[PDB]
Design a protein around this ligand. Structure first.
Ligand SMILES: [Zn+2]
Ligand SMILES: [Zn+2]
Length: 96
């Protein structure tokens, strides 16, 4: 499960930087090999990027109740429509 085969280093095509499963996501690193006839096989040419090389953005809503940035996950849909969104926690704190 990592006796010595965990020293594999995948070259990044983005920053031409070579790193191990450390700087490589498990999902991306897994693409280094595929399953054939029920046998593990190394991909001929696996194209992957670094964790930082890949994009990462998420929508959020500014709250004036606590003056803290929060995602839309912890924010009700209606709270997003209003002109003054309030965290699902702030609303239960201000008794609205
Ligand atoms: Zn990279
Ligand atoms: Zn708030």
């Amino acid at each position: 499960m990592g006796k010595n085969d965990n020293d594999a280093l995948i070259m990044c095509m983005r920053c031409r930087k070579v790193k191990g499963i450390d700087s490589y996501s498990k999902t991306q690193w897994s693409k280094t090999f595929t399953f054939v006839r029920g046998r593990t096989v190394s991909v001929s040419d696996p194209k992957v990027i670094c964790r930082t090389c890949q994009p990462k953005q998420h929508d959020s809503i500014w709250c004036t109740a606590c003056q803290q940035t929060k995602g839309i996950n912890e924010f009700s849909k209606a709270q997003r429509h209003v002109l003054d969104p309030r965290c699902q926690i702030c609303v239960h704190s201000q008794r609205n």
